[PDB]
Design a protein around this ligand. Structure first.
Ligand code: TP7
Ligand code: TP7
Ligand code: COM
Ligand code: MG
Ligand code: MG
Ligand code: MG
Ligand code: MG
Lengths: 246, 442, 548, 442
C-alpha cells in the first residue's frame, strides 16, 4: 500500500505511522501497572469488569461471518469498552489527530477511533486497550511535552507553550521537572491524583520533533510546497464534484 | 435489459447459486421477491394482546406513567384470544380465502396480522394496516365481552393510545416496521424510517441477512425518492448487488481473507488489488513513489468500494463484537481509500460525511444515541443514498451485548412477530432465487 | 500595513503576537475576570434567596488557568469579555431575532380586487390611507367594531405597526408618509430603480406584531395576528358587513395567498411553525441585513455584516438554544465577527481576485475555484502559523475552519459572480485545511463538508438547490455549528460584488429598510457591541405592569 | 355477498343503466373502476413546461417574488418539448409496453405524465409520481441543451422549487391532486387532502360528476382510515351509493321535483314522504299533533337523508348559482330534519357540526376562505366521515362566478391536464359500468 502522497518528511512520516510493517521507534519504558494507572478505569490487580458473558457461554447463532472473523481477546471475555485519548500540540508534536485515526485503523483490530481538533480517542475492549495503550505511550506516537493523555478538559493543542516547552493543561496532569529535565505524570487521564508519579522520560528536542512531525507548517515543511500531496486533494475534490452531478 | 452488466449470485454460506444474471433481475422494479418483501412490510402488524389486557386492568393508557383511576376494566383477553382473533379476521379480510393472515403467538399473548393486499390497491399509502387492524381488534374485544358503550372508549385507548390528541399512536399496543407518514424527513422516505434494530431483530442477528434486508429497504427507497432514475439507476443497482447481495462473492471473500487477523487497512489493500485485477481501475499517472489510479466506470468502482466497506465493517466490528465502531469504519475506510488511490470514496464522499455526523451523534451529549436507533430517515444518517445504513445493520448484528438500547430493548415485539415471516428473516435466499427464475425475462 | 487583527491581539496578551511562549496558572482562575467575579457574587445571592445552590466556581474544573480574553467586536473599538456576547446576556441579539420573528409581509393586491370586484367598491389612495390609520390602531390590539372590548395597553405594544411600500411612485406620494417605506429615500438610486421594477404596481404591507406577544407565543403567531387585525381594519374602513362571505376572501388572502413568511415550517424531528430561525433561507437572511444599502462601495463589508447576522442567529440562538441549549455556542459564532480576523482574510482574497481577474470577471468554472479558494485558504492558515497569539485566540479548530473557508468561499464568489462556485470553494478549503494541519473541527464538524463537493452541483431531489435557496433545513446543513451564518455570507458575496440590490427576495430587502425597527439592521456588528455594553434598549419588557 | 342490499344504477341524465346491483359491487375494495381512479390519481402529474421556461429566463425560482439576479438561463424548452418529453418518458417507464403515459398539451406548454403502476407496487406511498417525474424532466432538459454542471441546479429549482429547504415543493412547476404526506391531519387522510376546486376543475363543472368524484375519494379514504370496517362498513357503502352515485335515481328525482320552485324545506318534506313509502322509517309514537318516527335500519335512514342533503344543496345553491350557501344548507337541512322527524341527522350530527364550523370559517376573519379551498383534510371540514364534502363540490360546480378563489384561480393546471383523463372527468360512467360487469361475482 502507498497510504499517502507527497515528498516531504511530513508525508513520509504520515506513511510510516500508517504502515503496519514500519517499526515504531520505542523511546521509553512504562510498566504494565503504570499503564493501568494512567488509564484510570480499574486498579492494578482488580479483575476486568464485564458487560456481557464470555462468548463461549452465549451460544450465538449460525452466521458464516461470525465464524470467519476472530474476536479480539477482550471481546471473548466480555470486557467493558474503555478509552484512551490524546491531545497533540500544533507545535510539532510527532502525531496529530487524523494521523492517529488513520494509523489506528491500519494497525489495530476492533477499533473505534474518533478525530477532533483538540482530542483524538480510541475505544475498544479493556484488556486490548491496555496493550495498545502501552505502544501508544512507549513509542514515537508520544512526546511527554508536546502530547498529553486527557480524558477531559483537553484545551491546549492550539495554545502557546509554557516557558519549559510544555503544552498547556488545565489540570496539570504532566509536570516538567526543571531540576532533572524529565516529565512525570502526576494524575491519571481524567485528572485524579496518582499514588506514585510515572516517569515519561525526556522531551524530544526541537530538531528531532521537526524530523518526526506529521503537521505541515510554514516554519517546518509547508503543505503548499508539497505539490504532489496538494494535487491529489484537488483531484478528489474535482472527482467528487463531477460524480455528484453526473 | 437496459444495462449490459451481469453478476454471479451466491448464498449466505459462500456457495454459488446462479451465474451471469442480468443486473436488473435484482432491481426492486423487476424482482418479485423484493415486491413481496415491500408489500409484506406495508401490511404486517403486530398486536400485543397481553399489553392491551394489562393496560385495561390498570387503566394505564395514553403514554408513559399515565393512568386514569376509576376506569379499570378486568377482561380475560389472552384467555379468549382465539375467539377474538377470529372475529377480527372476518372484519379485516375482504373475501374468504384472500391473503389475510392472523396467527396467535405465545399462547395468545401476541398476534401476527397481515392485512389483505386488496386494501392497499385502493389506498394512497400504508396506514390502513395499523388502523384497520386496530379497529377490528377493538370491535372484536367489545363484542366478545359485551363491553358497554360507557366503557368501550378505554379499549380504544388501550389499543391505539393517545391518538388523535397525539399525532402518533402514543402508548399503543400495536407495532409496525414503518412509522407514521407525518414523520418523514421528505416525500418518499417511508421505507427509510425503519430502525436498524428492527432489521436486526427480524433477521435474528444473522449478519448477511441483516445487511441484505437493510440494503433492499434502503435501495428500494431510492427508487421511490427518484434518486435511482436515469443516469443514477445503474449506480444504485450495482450498490444493491455488490454491497447487499454478495454479488460475485466479493464481500464474503474479503471477509474470509481478513477475518482472522485483518484490519480496515488490510481490507482496503485487498479491495484495491481485486479492483485492479478485474479491470475496474487502472493506473492513470505516476507521481513520486505514488500511483494515481483512474477508472472508466465510476459506478462500478463505487460498487467495488462499497463491497469492501461492508467487509471492513464486518472485520473491524466483528473483531470487537461491538457495534459502536461502525461510525469510525464508515469514516476512515473512505478517508483512507481516497488517499490510497486518488479516486473518490463510496457515494462520492457522502458515506464519509454521514459517518462524521454519525460518529459525533453516537459519542456526544447533543443527540442521536447508539447505532441501533438510527435509520435512513434520521437527520443524522439520511445523507448517503443507501450505502451507509446496511453497514450499521451488519455491525449491530455482530454486537455481543455492549448496547443499552439493543434490539431486545427497542424491538422485542418485532423480533417475536416479524421474524416469523420467512421473507423478512432470510430475504437473501428469496431475492436470489427469484432473480434466477426471471434471468431470461430481463 | 499591519494585518487588521494585530491591534486586538496586542490588547489581549502582554506578549507580542509572534511570541511562541507564555506563562499559565498564575492568573488566579476566575478572579482575573470582572465578569466572572460579578457572576460568582450573583450566584451566592441567588442561592441564598431561593434556597437552592446555583452558580458556584468550585464545581467542575477551574476556569481561567489561561488568559480569559476580551474580544474586539469587528469594525468597532469596543472590547468586551465573551460573556457579554452570549445571547442570554445581550439584549441586542435578542431584539434582532424578535424583530425578524414578529415581521410578516402581506400583499394588498388580492384584497383590493375583492373590494372592487366582489363588493363593487372603489380603492383610492384616500381609502388606503384611511385603512392604514385604522390598522395602526387595530394591529397592536385595539378595537374598531364591537362594544365592550378590552384592549392591550398601548405602551406595552408601542413597537407594533404597519407600513406599506410600492414601486408606483405616484401612489406612494399620495399616501401619508408616516405609513410609507420610501424606496427612493432609503436606497441609492441604482438600487432603488431595480427594486421598484421588481415590485411594480403591487402594494405590500410590512406588519410587525408586538415583541411582548412574540416572546409570550412563537413565530407562527405572527401571520395569524397580522391577518386578524387586517381583517378587522378592512371591515371597518371599507364598510362591509362585520362578517359576511367576502370577509373570508380577505382572511385567505392575508393568511395564505399573499403572505411572505420569514421562515417556513420544519419537519417533525425538529418540529417548528413558521417564522422560526430554521425556516429562514440564507438568501432571506442576507436580504434582511441592510448593510447592502449603506456599504455598497465595499463588498467585503456587506458580505461580512451578513456573516455576523447569520453567525449570531443561526449558531448562538438557533443551534445553540432552540436545538441544544445550555452554555451554548457563543464563541463558535464570535470567531466570525470579532478581532477583525475574518475581515483580514477576506480583504486579502478580494485583492487577489481584483488584481488577477477583476471582480466578477473570472470564468465561472472549477479552474477559478481551485485557484482562488486554494490561495485564500493557504493565506489564512499561514496567519495562524506566523502568529501564535492568533492561534490561541481562535483555539477551536471548528472556529478556524469556518473563518478560513468563509474567506475562501466569499473570495471565489467575488471572482465568479456566482454563489454556487463560491460554495465549491468553501468545501475545497475544508479539505486542504484538514490535510495541512491533520485536524479540522469538532467530532461532527465536516458531515456536510464531506458530502459537500458532490452536492454543490447535484440536481437530485433533496440534494440539488442553488445556495441562495438553501437554509438551515437543507438536509446536510440541519445539525452543525460553524457553517450556516458563513453560507449566508457566501450567498451575499457575488451579489455585493455585482452591485445587486438584493440576493433572493426584493420584498424582504425593502421590508427591513425601516427606521422604526428596534434593532438597527444597517449596523449589525455595532448593535452587538452596544448590547454587550448593556446600552441597548429592547422592546417587550413588562416594567409598566409590575411593582417597583 | 356480505350484505343483501341491492341498488338500481342510473347515469347523469337520469336514465337507468342496470337493475338490482348488489351493494358491494360499488365498494372501493371490489369495484375495478374505483381502483383505476385511485391508482390514476396517485400516478398522474402535470408538468408546466412553459412555467419552467419562464422561471429560468427570469431566474424567478423558489417561491413568491423570489429571484436570483445573474442566474438567468435562456432555453427554448417549449420549442423542443417533443424531444424532452420523449427523453423523459424513457427515464420514467419501467418497460417499453407498460402503462407509462406522457402526452403534450397546449402545443408543448404542458405535459400529462402518468408514472407506471409498477413503480407503486414497490413503493410505500405516492410521492414517487412527482419525484420521478421531476428528476426525469430535469435530466431530460439538461441533456437536451447540454446545460453545464455549473448551471444545472437552476433547472432543478425551476422544476421542484425550494425543496428540500422547504418541506413542500414551494415554487414548483409541477402539480398533483394529492399533497405531500407530511400535511395529513392524520394517518390515512391522503385521499382527503384534495381541494374541492381540484375536483370541480377535473370534472369541468358537471355537477353530478363532481359529486361522484368527491364521494368516491371521501368514502375510499374512509376505508384507508379504517372507519368503514366491521360494524360501520354498510353505512359507508350505502352513503357512497345514495349520495354520490345517484342510487335509485333518488337525488335526481328530488331535484327534478323541487328544482323549479323548491327550497331546503320542501326537499325535506319530499324525502320524509319517500322514506315512509319505502318503509325506511315508520311512525313509532304519537305526541300532541306530532308524529315521532323510528327506524329499524339506521344505516338506510342515514343514506336516504344523505341523498336529500345532496338534493337540498343542488336546489338551494343551484337557485342562487352561488356556492357560499352550501354551508347553510348542510347545517339547517340536518337541523330541520331532526325536529321534523325525531330521528338523528346525517352522520349522527357530524354533518351539522361540520357545517357550523364551515359556515364560520367561510364568513369570518379567522381563517378558512371560500368553499372551493376546503377538503376532507382541512381542520374545519374533516369531521364528517364522507357526507359533507361531496355537497361542497356540487355547490362549486354550480357557481356562476361569485368566487374570487375559484377553480380557475387555484386549479387551472389541474383543469387543463387532469380533465383529459376520461375516468377523472366522467367517473360516474366508469364506476357504474364496472359495477354492472361484476354484479355476479359478488
Ligand atoms: C440530531 C437530533 O437529535 P435527536 O437524535 O433527534 O435526539 C437533533 N439535534 C441536533 O441537531 C443538535 C443540533 C445542535 C447541537 C449540535 C451543534 S454542532 C434534534 O434535537 O432534533
Ligand atoms: C382554521 C385554520 O385556519 P386556516 O384555514 O388554515 O387559515 C386554523 N385557524 C384557527 O383554527 C383559528 C382558531 C382561533 C380563532 C377562532 C376561535 S373561535 C389555523 O390558523 O391553522
Ligand atoms: O467534542 S464534540 O466534537 O463531540 C462537541 C464539540 S462542542
Ligand atoms: Mg515493558
Ligand atoms: Mg467460492
Ligand atoms: Mg434606536
Ligand atoms: Mg291523527
Amino acid at each position: 500500500a502507498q497510504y499517502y502522497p507527497g515528498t516531504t518528511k511530513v508525508a513520509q512520516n504520515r506513511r510510516n505511522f500508517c504502515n503496519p510493517e514500519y517499526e515504531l521507534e520505542k523511546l521509553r519504558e512504562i510498566s504494565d501497572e503504570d499503564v493501568v494507572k494512567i488509564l484510570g478505569h480499574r486498579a492494578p490487580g482488580e479483575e476486568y469488569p464485564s458487560v456481557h458473558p464470555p462468548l463461549e457461554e452465549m451460544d450465538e447463532p449460525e452466521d458464516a461471518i461470525r465464524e470467519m472473523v476472530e474476536p479480539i481477546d477482550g471481546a471473548k471475555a466480555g470486557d467493558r469498552v474503555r478509552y484512551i485519548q490524546f491531545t497533540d500540540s500544533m507545535y510539532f508534536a510527532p502525531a496529530q489527530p487524523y494521523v492517529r485515526s488513520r494509523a489506528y485503523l491500519c494497525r489495530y483490530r476492533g477499533a473505534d477511533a474518533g478525530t477532533l481538533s483538540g482530542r483524538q480517542i480510541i475505544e475498544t475492549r479493556e484488556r486490548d486497550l491496555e496493550k495498545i495503550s502501552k505502544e501508544l505511550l512507549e513509542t514515537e506516537f508520544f512526546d511527554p511535552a508536546r502530547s498529553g493523555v486527557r480524558g477531559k478538559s483537553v484545551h491546549g493543542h492550539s495554545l502557546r507553550l509554557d516557558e519549559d516547552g510544555m503544552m498547556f493543561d488545565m489540570l496539570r496532569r504532566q509536570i516538567y521537572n526543571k531540576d532533572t529535565g524529565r516529565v512525570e505524570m502526576v494524575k491519571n487521564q481524567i485528572g485524579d491524583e496518582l499514588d506514585e508519579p510515572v516517569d515519561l522520560g525526556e522531551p524530544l528536542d526541537e530538531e528531532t520533533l521537526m524530523e518526526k512531525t506529521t503537521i505541515y507548517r510554514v516554519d517546518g515543511e509547508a503543505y503548499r510546497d508539497d505539490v504532489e500531496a496538494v494535487e491529489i486533494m484537488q483531484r478528489i475534490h474535482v472527482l467528487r464534484s463531477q460524480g455528484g452531478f453526473n | 435489459a437496459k444495462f449490459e452488466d451481469k453478476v454471479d449470485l451466491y448464498d449466505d454460506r459462500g456457495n454459488l447459486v446462479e451465474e451471469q444474471v442480468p443486473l436488473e433481475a435484482l432491481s426492486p422494479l423487476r424482482n418479485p421477491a423484493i415486491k413481496s418483501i415491500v408489500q409484506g412490510i406495508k401490511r404486517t402488524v403486530a398486536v400485543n394482546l397481553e399489553g392491551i389486557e394489562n393496560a385495561l386492568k390498570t387503566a394505564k393508557v395514553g403514554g408513559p406513567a399515565c393512568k386514569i383511576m376509576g376506569r379499570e376494566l378486568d377482561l380475560d383477553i389472552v384467555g379468549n384470544a382465539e375467539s377474538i382473533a377470529a372475529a377480527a379476521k372476518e372484519m379485516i379480510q375482504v373475501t374468504e380465502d384472500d391473503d389475510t393472515n392472523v396467527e396467535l403467538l405465545g399462547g395468545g399473548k401476541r398476534a401476527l396480522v397481515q392485512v389483505p393486499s386488496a386494501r392497499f390497491d385502493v389506498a394512497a399509502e400504508y396506514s390502513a394496516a395499523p388502523l384497520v387492524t386496530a379497529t377490528a381488534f377493538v370491535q372484536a374485544i367489545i363484542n366478545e365481552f359485551d363491553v358497554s358503550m360507557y366503557d368501550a372508549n378505554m379499549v380504544k385507548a388501550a389499543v391505539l393510545g393517545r391518538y388523535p390528541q397525539s399525532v402518533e399512536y402514543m402508548g399503543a399496543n400495536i407495532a409496525t416496521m414503518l412509522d407514521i407518514p407525518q414523520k418523514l424527513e421528505g416525500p418518499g422516505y417511508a421505507l427509510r424510517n425503519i430502525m436498524v434494530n428492527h432489521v436486526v431483530a427480524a433477521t435474528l442477528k444473522n449478519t448477511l441477512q441483516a445487511a441484505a434486508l437493510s440494503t433492499i429497504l434502503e435501495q428500494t427507497a431510492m427508487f421511490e425518492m427518484g434518486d435511482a432514475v436515469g443516469a443514477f439507476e445503474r449506480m444504485h443497482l450495482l450498490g444493491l448487488a455488490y454491497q447487499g447481495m454478495n454479488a460475485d462473492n466479493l464481500v464474503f471473500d474479503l471477509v474470509k481473507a481478513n477475518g482472522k487477523e485483518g484490519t480496515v487497512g488490510s481490507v482496503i489493500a485487498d479491495l484495491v488489488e481485486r479492483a485492479l485485477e478485474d479491470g475496474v481501475i487502472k493506473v492513470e499517472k505516476e507521481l513520486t513513489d505514488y500511483k494515481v489510479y483512474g477508472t472508466d466506470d465510476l459506478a462500478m468502482w463505487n460498487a467495488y468500494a462499497a463491497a469492501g466497506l461492508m467487509a471492513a465493517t464486518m472485520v473491524n466490528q466483528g473483531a470487537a463484537r461491538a457495534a459502536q465502531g461502525v461510525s469510525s469504519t464508515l469514516l476512515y475506510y473512505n478517508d483512507l481509500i481516497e488517499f490510497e488511490t486518488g479516486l473518490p470514496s463510496v457515494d462520492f464522499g457522502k458515506v464519509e460525511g454521514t459517518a462524521v455526523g454519525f460518529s459525533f451523534f453516537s459519542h456526544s451529549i447533543y443527540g442521536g444515541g447508539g447505532p441501533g436507533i438510527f435509520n435512513g430517515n434520521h437527520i443524522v444518517t439520511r445523507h448517503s443514498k443507501g450505502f451507509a445504513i446496511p453497514c450499521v445493520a451488519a455491525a449491530m448484528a455482530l454486537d455481543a451485548g455492549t448496547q443499552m438500547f439493543s434490539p431486545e430493548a427497542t424491538s422485542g415485539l418485532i423480533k417475536e412477530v416479524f421474524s416469523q415471516v420467512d421473507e423478512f428473516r432470510e430475504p437473501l435466499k428469496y431475492v436470489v432465487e427469484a432473480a434466477a427464475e426471471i434471468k431470461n425475462e430481463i | 500595513a499591519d494585518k487588521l487583527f494585530i491591534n486586538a491581539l496586542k490588547k489581549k496578551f502582554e506578549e507580542s503576537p509572534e511570541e511562541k511562549k507564555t506563562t499559565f496558572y498564575t492568573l488566579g482562575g476566575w478572579k482575573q475576570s470582572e465578569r466572572k467575579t460579578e457572576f460568582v457574587n450573583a450566584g451566592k445571592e441567588v442561592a441564598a434567596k431561593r434556597g437552592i445552590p446555583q452558580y458556584n466556581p468550585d464545581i467542575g474544573t477551574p476556569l481561567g488557568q489561561r488568559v480569559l480574553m476580551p474580544y474586539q467586536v469587528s469594525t468597532t473599538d469596543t472590547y468586551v469579555e465573551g460573556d457579554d456576547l452570549h445571547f442570554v446576556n445581550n439584549a441586542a441579539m435578542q431584539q434582532m431575532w424578535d424583530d425578524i420573528r414578529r415581521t410578516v409581509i402581506v400583499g394588498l393586491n388580492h384584497a383590493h380586487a375583492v373590494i372592487e370586484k366582489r363588493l363593487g367598491k372603489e380603492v383610492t389612495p384616500e381609502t388606503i390611507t384611511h385603512y392604514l390609520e385604522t390598522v395602526n390602531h387595530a394591529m397592536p390590539g385595539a378595537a374598531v367594531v364591537q362594544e365592550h372590548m378590552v384592549e392591550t395597553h398601548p405602551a406595552l405594544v408601542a413597537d407594533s405597526y404597519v407600513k406599506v411600500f410600492t414601486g408606483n411612485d405616484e401612489i406612494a406620494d399620495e399616501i401619508d408618509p408616516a405609513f410609507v417605506i420610501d424606496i427612493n429615500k432609503q436606497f441609492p438610486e441604482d438600487q432603488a430603480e431595480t427594486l421598484k421594477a421588481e415590485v411594480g404596481d403591487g402594494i405590500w404591507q410590512v406588519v410587525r406584531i408586538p415583541t411582548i406577544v412574540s416572546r409570550t407565543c412563537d413565530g407562527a403567531t405572527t401571520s395569524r395576528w397580522s391577518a386578524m387585525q387586517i381583517g378587522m381594519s378592512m371591515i371597518s374602513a371599507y364598510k362591509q358587513a362585520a362578517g359576511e362571505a367576502a370577509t373570508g376572501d380577505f382572511a385567505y388572502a392575508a393568511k395564505h395567498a399573499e403572505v411572505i413568511h420569514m421562515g417556513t415550517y420544519l419537519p417533525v424531528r425538529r418540529a417548528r411553525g413558521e417564522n422560526e430561525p430554521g425556516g429562514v433561507p440564507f438568501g432571506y437572511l442576507a436580504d434582511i441585513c441592510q448593510s447592502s444599502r449603506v456599504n455598497y462601495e465595499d463588498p467585503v463589508r456587506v458580505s461580512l455584516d451578513v456573516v455576523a447576522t447569520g453567525a449570531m442567529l443561526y449558531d448562538q440562538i438557533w443551534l445553540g438554544s432552540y436545538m441544544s441549549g445550555g452554555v451554548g455556542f457563543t464563541q463558535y459564532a464570535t470567531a466570525a465577527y470579532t478581532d477583525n480576523i475574518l475581515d483580514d482574510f477576506t480583504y486579502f482574497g478580494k485583492e487577489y481576485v481584483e488584481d488577477k481577474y477583476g471582480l466578477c470577471e473570472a470564468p465561472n468554472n472549477m479552474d477559478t475555484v481551485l485557484d482562488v479558494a486554494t490561495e485564500v485558504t493557504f493565506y489564512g492558515l499561514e496567519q495562524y502559523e506566523e502568529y501564535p497569539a492568533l492561534l490561541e485566540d481562535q483555539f477551536g479548530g471548528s472556529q478556524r475552519a469556518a473563518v478560513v473557508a468563509a474567506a475562501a468561499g466569499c473570495s471565489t464568489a467575488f471572482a465568479t459572480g456566482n454563489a454556487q462556485t463560491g460554495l465549491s470553494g468553501w468545501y475545497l478549503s475544508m479539505y486542504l485545511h484538514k490535510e495541512q494541519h491533520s485536524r479540522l473541527g469538532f467530532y461532527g464538524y465536516d458531515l456536510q463538508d464531506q458530502c459537500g463537493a458532490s452536492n454543490v452541483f447535484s440536481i437530485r431531489g433533496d440534494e440539488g438547490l442553488p445556495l441562495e435557496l438553501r437554509g438551515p433545513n437543507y438536509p446536510n446543513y440541519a445539525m452543525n455549528v460553524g457553517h450556516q451564518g458563513e453560507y449566508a455570507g457566501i450567498s451575499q458575496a457575488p451579489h455585493a460584488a455585482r452591485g445587486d440590490a438584493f440576493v433572493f427576495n426584493p420584498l424582504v430587502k425593502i421590508a427591513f429598510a425601516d427606521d422604526n425597527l428596534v434593532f438597527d439592521f444597517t449596523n449589525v456588528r455595532g448593535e452587538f457591541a452596544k448590547g454587550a455594553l448593556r446600552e441597548f434598549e429592547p422592546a417587550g419588557e413588562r416594567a409598566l405592569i409590575t411593582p417597583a
